[PDB]
Amino acid sequence: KGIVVEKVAIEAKQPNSAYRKCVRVQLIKNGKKITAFVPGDGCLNFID
Amino acid sequence: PKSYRNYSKTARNPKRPFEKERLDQELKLIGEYGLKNKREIWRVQYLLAKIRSAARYLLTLDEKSSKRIFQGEALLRRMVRQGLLGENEEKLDYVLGLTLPKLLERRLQTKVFKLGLAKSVHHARVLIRQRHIRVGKQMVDIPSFLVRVDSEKHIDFATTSPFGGARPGRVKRKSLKKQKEKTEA
Amino acid sequence: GSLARAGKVKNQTPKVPKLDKKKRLTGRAKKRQLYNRRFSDNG
Amino acid sequence: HGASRYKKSRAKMRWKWKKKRTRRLQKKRRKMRQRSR
RNA sequence: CUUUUGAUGUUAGGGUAUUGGCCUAACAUGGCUAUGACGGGUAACGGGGAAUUAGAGUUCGAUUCCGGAGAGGGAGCCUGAGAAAUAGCUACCACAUCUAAGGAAGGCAGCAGGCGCGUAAAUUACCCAAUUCUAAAGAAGAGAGGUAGUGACAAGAAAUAACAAUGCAAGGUUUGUAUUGGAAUGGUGGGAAUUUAAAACCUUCCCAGAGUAACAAUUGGAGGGCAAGUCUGGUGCCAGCAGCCGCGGUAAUUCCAGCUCCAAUAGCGUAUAUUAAAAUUGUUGCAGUUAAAACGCUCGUAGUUGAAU
RNA sequence: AAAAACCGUAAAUCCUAUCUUUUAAAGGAAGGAGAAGUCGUAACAAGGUUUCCGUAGGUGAACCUGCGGAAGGAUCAU
RNA sequence: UAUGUUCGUUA
RNA sequence: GCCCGGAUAGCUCAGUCGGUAGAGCAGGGGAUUGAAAAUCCCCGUGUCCUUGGUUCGAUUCCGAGUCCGGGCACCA
C-alpha cells in the first residue's frame, strides 16, 4: 500500500509507440518510491 | 485446539487444460452418462488411479508373499463387491484393466436408468435429486451413490414418492377441479 | 504532458445496450445441449 | 569474463584495447583513493 | 582458536540432591581444528510431520501431539515435594495509572476486546452438559474445555430442471429441434417432533409455496502457445492490449463495444513464494575442440581409488 | 526488629574500544536506457594496414606502434 | 602491390 | 557603500549619429514521407524593464529607481 505522488506517462519501447500511464507511489511500509502501471483505458483519470 | 478429523481431495485437475482429444472424449462420456460436470469424471478417474496404483504395486510383489496374498484378495473382494469385476475375472491382472465407463456404470443414476424407472439418464439424475428412489429400506438422493452387487436387486421407488405409494397428484390441481365441479353441481 | 487523452476511445466508443435475449442454460442441462448437437444434424 | 573474451563474432571493441582502457581507469581510481585515504 | 578473567587435566577441598572446573588452592601445558575449529548469517525453536513426488530429489514445518524456552528487558529471592514462578515478591531500565502532591498501585506472547502495525487474521457471546484437572473430592469451580457468532482459509456432497404431442431437419416411419401442459421437487415462510446445559443447525412430519421455474451463474478468454470469430460498429502508432512471440498508421480475427462461441464452474481470475516441468545443479543423471567451461606445466600432502593368489 | 560491615549473586548507568547494519556529502568516475545528436571508419570481403592474444608506450575517438605468440587465415600444397 | 569516407529511424 | 554594464517575443540575442521594431529556439498550419525524423514555407506573440523629462515625435538622447551581473579602496 502506497501514496500516489504523481502521474507520469512513460514512453514505450522502440518497436511500439505508446504513452503508458503510470503513477509514482511512495510506499507507507518503508517509504520507497516505486512506479506502478495503471491498467485500463481511462483508469488514470480514476486515480487522483 | 484444531479439529482432529481428516479431510482430503477426491479429484485432481488434469494439467494440460486444452487437449482437444481429451476434451472430446470427456464430453462424450459426460453427455452419455448425464453427469453434471467434468469434476465428477475427475473424481472417478482419481479413484480409478488409486485402485490401479494399489494393484500395480501388488503385481511387483512376487506371488505367495504375505503382503500380496493379503491385500490382493482384500482389493479383489472389494472390487467384486463393487461389481466392477465378474466371475470371468479372477486375478490381479484384470483390476488393471478397469475403465472409466465400467466405473461409471455403477453410479445410481445409470443403474436406475438401466433398470427402468426413468426413461433417461438425466431423468434418473433429477429423480434421485427429487428423492423418489430407494436402495432397500434406505432412500438415497445422491446420484453418484455407487451401487454394489447386493443393491441393484433392491433398487426401486421410494415409499414416500408419489410414484411409490404416497400422495398421488398435485394438490392444487386435484382441488380446483373438484371446486369447479361442486360449483357447477 | 500528453496524458490529457487518457481513455479517449472508452469515451468516444458508441454505447449500445445488451438487448433482451433469453436466459442461458447452466449446469448439467447446459452440458446436455453442447453434447447432443455434434453428431445428429452434422454428417 | 572467462576464456571467451575477445572472440569478436559480434563486431565489438577489440578486447585488448578495452582491457587497456579499463586498466588505465583502474590506475586513475587507485591513485585517487590513495590521495584521499 | 582456547589459555591472566578456567582454557585441558591431576591432587585436595568447598558446594550440590547427586557426578563434574561447578567453584577455590597448588601443580602440569594441555584441549579443538581443512573430516572446517573459532567466527559471521539465518526474514532459524527442534521433532512427529506438510507440499510436490515414476524413482531419485527439492522445498516447507510460528500452528492440534512431544521436548525446549519466555511472560516489557535484565537480575535476585521467599514458600514449597516441586518455581529462579511472574494473573508470587524485591530492585534497576523503558513505558504507564490514581493522587488532596504526602504517597499508592502495574505487566493480555490467558479468553474476548482496543490502538498501532501492516497485503495479512473473528464475539468485550452462552455453558460447565461432554473431556479432564484441583479441592476439605458426587453436589464447587475451571475464557482449561465445549456450544454457538463472524468466517468463499482449506475440504466433501450437490440445485439452477425432467417429461409427452404436433411444425422443421436428417433417414428408411428412427433422432435432434419451437409451441404448448400437466406431473416432480427442493430453495422460502409458518408450525411441530426432535436436538441442545438452554438455544441454533442437521434430520423427519404438516400447511402454502415454480413457467420468462425474473427462484433470471459467474469468472476469464476467442492470432499462436491454447479451447474458441478472417462477424458487425468505434478508434486509427492514439487510446490501449499484450506472461512470451506480437497487435494497433482505415478490412484491427489481438484495443474499446454488440452478437456468437470456448473454458472451468458456485466458482473463476490476479500478485508473490514454492514444487514438478529442470537430465537448466545431473548419486541415479548434464556439459567442458568450436555454444559457458581442462589449471601454463610438472611435483606433491590430505582426500578418493587400487593387480592376481 | 531496625541498622551496619564483609565475601558473593549482580540489574543499571557512564567512559573507552571494536564490530555489524543503515545513511548524508562538494567533487570524481563507471554502467545501463533513450526512434532519429557531432566526429571520424575501428571490425565483418585480403573490410581496403589479415584478424586476434599477452605486454609496454603513444594518440580526440574508435585505435596506432614495438617484442613474443595463435590461426579462430587470406596458405592443409615442389 | 599510390588515395578513394559516409548512407538517419520504423515498418 | 560609490565606478561600469544589460533589461527587446514564450526563452535566448541584433538595431542609420532618434523615424521600421527584427533573426534562432519554443509555436499552429502546412510542403515531403508508407509513417516519422531531418529539410523547406508561412502564423502568431513585445509600452524594447519601471518612472519621469528633451523632441514634432524616444527602444534610441538624458535623470532617477529596480534586478542581476563586470572593474574600485588606507595607512604603517
Side-chain angles (χ1 to χ4, degrees), chain C residues 7-36:
Chain C
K8 45 164 306 203
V9 316
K10 258 295 271 175
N11 318 332
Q12 38 238 56
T13 175
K15 273 212 99 163
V16 296
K18 275 249 169 50
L19 46 83
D20 156 31
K21 52 84 190 164
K22 201 55 75 68
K23 159 199 176 201
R24 193 105 42 174
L25 179 59
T26 182
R28 182 212 21 100
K30 156 141 198 192
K31 314 294 246 191
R32 274 193 90 177
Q33 84 221 36
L34 284 317
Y35 156 75
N36 53 39

Side-chain angles (χ1 to χ4, degrees), chain B residues 1-171 175-185:
Chain B
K2 297 179 160 73
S3 158
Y4 277 94
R5 76 148 35 82
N6 262 60
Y7 61 95
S8 318
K9 319 202 204 247
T10 55
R12 181 211 208 182
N13 235 264
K15 107 166 298 283
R16 204 178 270 277
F18 302 117
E19 268 170 290
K20 196 61 158 286
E21 91 293 311
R22 196 249 306 164
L23 287 203
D24 81 36
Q25 151 49 287
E26 158 212 330
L27 192 34
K28 227 75 55 68
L29 198 85
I30 278 187
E32 174 283 13
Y33 283 97
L35 57 169
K36 96 158 303 307
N37 235 6
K38 57 200 53 214
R39 200 193 171 281
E40 324 207 84
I41 96 111
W42 291 348
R43 319 185 315 222
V44 182
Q45 54 192 15
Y46 190 100
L47 193 45
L48 192 259
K50 188 89 47 53
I51 301 107
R52 291 204 54 257
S53 58
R56 176 252 203 79
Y57 165 73
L58 270 351
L59 281 310
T60 88
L61 307 190
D62 87 309
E63 265 316 355
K64 78 193 30 170
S65 191
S66 209
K67 197 167 280 133
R68 150 181 256 286
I69 71 194
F70 187 73
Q71 276 138 276
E73 41 278 87
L75 179 63
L76 273 186
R77 82 134 269 182
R78 190 171 23 213
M79 288 285 102
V80 306
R81 166 206 203 75
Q82 324 272 358
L84 317 157
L85 287 72
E87 297 78 66
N88 215 12
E89 275 110 10
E90 48 271 357
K91 306 291 145 271
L92 270 294
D93 255 334
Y94 313 142
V95 56
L96 276 186
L98 315 180
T99 56
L100 259 206
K102 79 156 59 134
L103 268 274
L104 286 182
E105 298 292 12
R106 315 299 312 183
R107 298 177 38 102
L108 199 42
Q109 59 174 56
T110 83
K111 298 247 69 159
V112 57
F113 163 65
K114 262 48 201 312
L115 288 162
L117 301 92
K119 30 197 62 67
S120 149
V121 81
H122 303 283
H123 177 211
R125 161 70 151 254
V126 80
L127 214 58
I128 289 146
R129 269 319 273 181
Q130 323 301 9
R131 60 205 299 226
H132 301 305
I133 285 81
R134 186 171 43 79
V135 201
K137 311 178 41 64
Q138 173 63 260
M139 71 101 102
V140 185
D141 67 297
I142 303 309
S144 63
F145 183 101
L146 266 39
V147 191
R148 292 156 200 171
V149 276
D150 309 36
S151 299
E152 329 85 305
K153 314 314 293 301
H154 330 108
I155 320 187
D156 87 272
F157 269 85
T159 67
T160 324
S161 87
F163 332 117
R167 197 229 51 198
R170 270 283 97 232
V171 171
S175 72
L176 272 194
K177 51 100 166 201
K178 87 170 267 170
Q179 297 317 314
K180 296 292 116 180
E181 225 178 312
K182 82 102 191 154
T183 326
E184 182 64 33

